[PDB]
Ligand binder design. Structure first.
Ligand SMILES: O=C(c1cccnc1)N1CCN2C(=O)c3ccncc3[C@@]12c1ccc(Cl)cc1
Lengths: 422, 422, 422
């Protein structure tokens, strides 16, 4: 299921076996709260009603390495577009109308957007009936929900994420998912991962008008599902000569998540925009580059003539470890002490100067200098691919050593150039 | 009102029409909570009083591209300076004294700071009266506020932001703003944008002593208001030759917010330190550089002899889009599919290799590779300024291609140098 | 106690006098909540019981400059390893068993991990007794705690930090610390800084099975305590020639926290991974490099032959200030206005072009351009170390000016090279 290959020649490892779930688009729903325009166990409701009035008062005052290659989006542009529609005249009344005999209804907005509208709290109907037994309790439980939505919007300037359980309860989110217009695969994936959906959603406050509070919930559309994904971990590969500062180093800069998508590979350079759940990888295509699938060739052979593998160079031989999915890459240089230990037995391997790797089978921790790393202890097979470390192929006298946005061919050109002068 | 110019020659766009609101300084107020030193409907207050004692117990245990050019400040240095004063002897008693007959009072501290002090909760007076009818309810509502302030300080190590509605209610914040010593313009701007004020404020726990809990609220001073602001969006400008990796690229690195300020331009390289509300731009001068106004000349003519426009160079021709205020810049290179669509009609434009631009009029989404971008759908006019793309002016054989902290003149010097050798 | 030296020659300052508290490892405890499997003042408990059932329902659906040199760890790898054990059969029942006659017990898990288990809420025993007077109140207070833990896990995908006061109360955290297996020094340091401990902890949801909710709390182990620490502040050092863009600049890139640790120095390049409490510095060794102690020699003499001091170079002479522990470094260049003021007296010093420094004694604010900086007003002595600014030692005609990952020797080599050609 989950497997891993370490490449000794380029000091990198590839974890495969994952399945994708990529946010490719947004769904926008309009959540509504109908409000009231009002001015022994009684005095309980007295303050509960002052709380209500203030919440409305408060709401109305309110409504007055390679990541640099990414483009720049506007995350809530679609949601805010729907908000601007809800300010047109009659547009709020059109909604209030549709949600008259039911909580859930689909409405066609004037600019031609079909949206799932949803009345999750009907305070108006509640207040203008009872407040004009358990009815004290239920008012507090619904009022408290109103106060919390109010709290959230007024410390986040009307835009919140993840969408809290007060903005949209589980039972509400689940049925919203079900009433959505998506495939059965998408419905199940969202239903079985609602905490992730919550984290990739936005809650946007739109309007208070005509006794209605309206906010858009902006939900993720996963248009790519169950394609193969793999994570690339890289570490500095340096020479290990004796005289200090006479060493040269080289790191693959294309680390991150890689997912097959529509004939290409989606690449996510900041592997923190992606959230892994078991063997499923939730990513957002806004944080990706679209590369040719040939990019995968860089792991097998970094000198392949089909794709120009990206690297940076330096003279900075510092030690560090990279904790992978199924093991640990260790770059030990200079006088650093680098080890790996079993939980009960102690040190089992001492690393030499160079870049090496150890799997999580039998290993619980790795130490580099004064830094303790615990390794992920998930089941999976690791393969160690022996190979000559490519930094040995370069003459230090003509090596370009501050290249960052570089590649194999750019380094080869700089070398060929400075070598020709000689 | 909001307008936009795209510059085809340098692959950048400028959105203008915004008005500034820059945090230039801090106001520090001392919020107080008077506490009590104490050891049928009755048993309600019993646990409500145990909650109180613990909160106090708990509080006392508690009280035992170009962003790298920015300097480094200490955000709460002014607030903490006031805290250190409140530990001097008599200094707390001086406050307790002033707030004896009113909730709001201005006190002169011994080190010569005139501060707006504010007793927002008087538990002492409440407890040592009633707890020695609705009085169970009001105790819970004030106690709950105490527990929440306690919660916040003890997960944020005594420093919180944005300042929550428990630290300072709307009604309290509003009158605090009104009793403040600032201009009527500043008062209105803060009153009409209290959620933004909250986000730019700090809450700093100072002391528990002599039955008083004291925290400083650190509020923003907007010393620059209603000056013109404009946002600069830039994208990679590359050549589009057929043989891959034979292309050269160039990006303007001075993207961010620009605001006229006191004869100069304040420049905010990380356009996320700035929050836009309609056409108003809230920035913080701590995250800015002060540039000559001549920096604006880089948009009209990037080769102007008055200011040295900053760029970076590469060989990395990857596709990406930049979503602007009123449209979209698209950098399409290689085999990438780049389009723009109308919401109901589908693809309306297919982009060629190069850097191009489309406005948000008639356009709802832009696609680059596997990445869908929604465009901002705000009203405004866009102007497309036709011009020869400057990367065509360079000979690829003598082009410096890993420059990051570069500029037009630095690139010209490197070229002139390597050309002279030839 | 806290002291500071500014080095005029390299435009940097060192704040010393701090004591370390480094997170070197993790302790993992298993917090449990025993649940119930169930289907006048009465109707209070009715909804309180529906809340309970849902929380369980909801939980079960749920359970279906130099920072780039750092390695990459997996912060909760140890905690999650314990979670995977708690899914083995009998493993939950082994715990439920041990916590039968007490809230606190140490259990040996099957894979040989001795963990402090802790039953912080016994709803089962409570529900299956009473709910089959004040007992309405206590149920609400314990139920509310259950709902909040539920809230937190379901917006954070089961992993929370800082560990909230609902996950683990103060009284619980304190005794957990006391029952822990650590030194008396560690116990006192944690007890006296529980808000910091909270911030460096993780709460990981593990399992619902056999009427038990289990989450791991992952607590910090401070294996290095009371070693000397010092912070290095650096600023751009530029020449100040008249013709613009004819100037060369140089910045020490090794700014951050430095702490003596086990014969070496732990270096924290991102001085925000470290939290200072008075004169104590809480760091995490995962965000550090292990350097030779000789790295300290770079402050006294940057040209020392024992360690190769790291720098970057540019032509970008922009003004900025760096607020230190006890003063302010100012880099004033070009036409920028740079001053320092006393709180009541006004401007007291106007800075010249160059890099200069002023202490916090008599000084309250510093101004660079349109940017106001407040200085830290803590007691301590500053020493100004006069010295020739090293950028004057370089010939601008052969100066390498886009070096970022550079050093004194690398710059000297580039110079020696381009000078030999001449
Ligand atoms: O980060 C900096 C930098 C510079 C000055 C002051 N503070 C930081 N630099 C300059 C050169 N650089 C590296 O060698 C490097 C390595 C890993 N991440 C970022 C960088 C980078 C860089 C960043 C973006 C691009 Cl397009 C190109 C290079």
């Amino acid at each position: 299921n989950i497997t891993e290959e370490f490449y000794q020649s380029t000091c990198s490892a590839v974890s495969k076996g994952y399945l994708s779930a990529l946010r490719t688009g947004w769904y926008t729903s309009v959540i509504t709260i109908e409000l009231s325009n009002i001015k022994a166990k009684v005095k309980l409701i007295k303050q509960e009603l002052d709380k209500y009035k203030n919440a409305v008062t408060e709401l109305q005052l309110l409504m007055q390495f390679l990541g640099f290659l990414l483009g720049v989006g506007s995350a809530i542009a679609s949601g805010v577009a729907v908000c601007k529609v809800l300010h047109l005249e009659g547009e709020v009344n059109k909604i209030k109308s549709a949600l008259l005999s039911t909580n859930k209804a689909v409405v066609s907005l004037s600019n031609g957007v079909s949206v799932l509208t949803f009345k999750v709290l009907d305070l108006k109907n509640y207040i203008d009936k009872q407040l004009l037994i358990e009815t004290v309790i239920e008012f507090q439980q619904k009022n408290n929900r109103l106060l919390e939505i109010t709290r959230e919007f007024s410390v986040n300037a009307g835009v919140t994420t993840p969408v809290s359980t007060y903005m949209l309860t589980n039972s509400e989110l689940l049925s919203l998912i079900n009433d959505m217009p998506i495939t059965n695969d998408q419905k199940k994936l969202m239903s079985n991962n609602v905490q992730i959906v919550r984290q990739q959603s936005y809650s946007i406050m739109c309007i208070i008008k005509e006794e209605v509070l309206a906010y858009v919930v902006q939900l993720p559309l996963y248009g790519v599902i169950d394609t193969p994904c793999w994570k690339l971990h890289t570490s500095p590969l340096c020479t290990t000569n004796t005289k200090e500062g006479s060493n040269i180093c080289l790191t693959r800069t294309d680390r991150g998540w890689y997912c097959d998508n529509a004939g290409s590979v989606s690449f996510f350079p900041q592997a923190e925009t992606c959230k892994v759940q078991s063997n499923r990888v939730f990513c957002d295509t806004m944080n990706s580059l679209t590369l040719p699938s040939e990019v995968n060739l860089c792991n097998v052979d970094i000198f392949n003539p089909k794709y120009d593998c990206k690297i940076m160079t330096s003279k900075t031989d510092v030690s560090s470890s990279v904790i992978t999915s199924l093991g640990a890459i260790v770059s030990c240089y200079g006088k650093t002490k680098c080890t790996a230990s079993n939980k009960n037995r102690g040190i089992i391997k001492t690393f030499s100067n160079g870049c090496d790797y150890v799997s999580n089978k039998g290993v619980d921790t790795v130490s580099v200098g004064n830094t303790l790393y615990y390794v992920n202890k998930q089941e999976g097979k690791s393969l160690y691919v022996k190979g000559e470390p490519i930094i040995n192929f370069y003459d230090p006298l003509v090596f370009p050593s501050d290249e960052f946005d570089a590649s194999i061919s750019q380094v080869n050109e700089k070398i060929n150039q400075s070598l020709a002068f000689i």
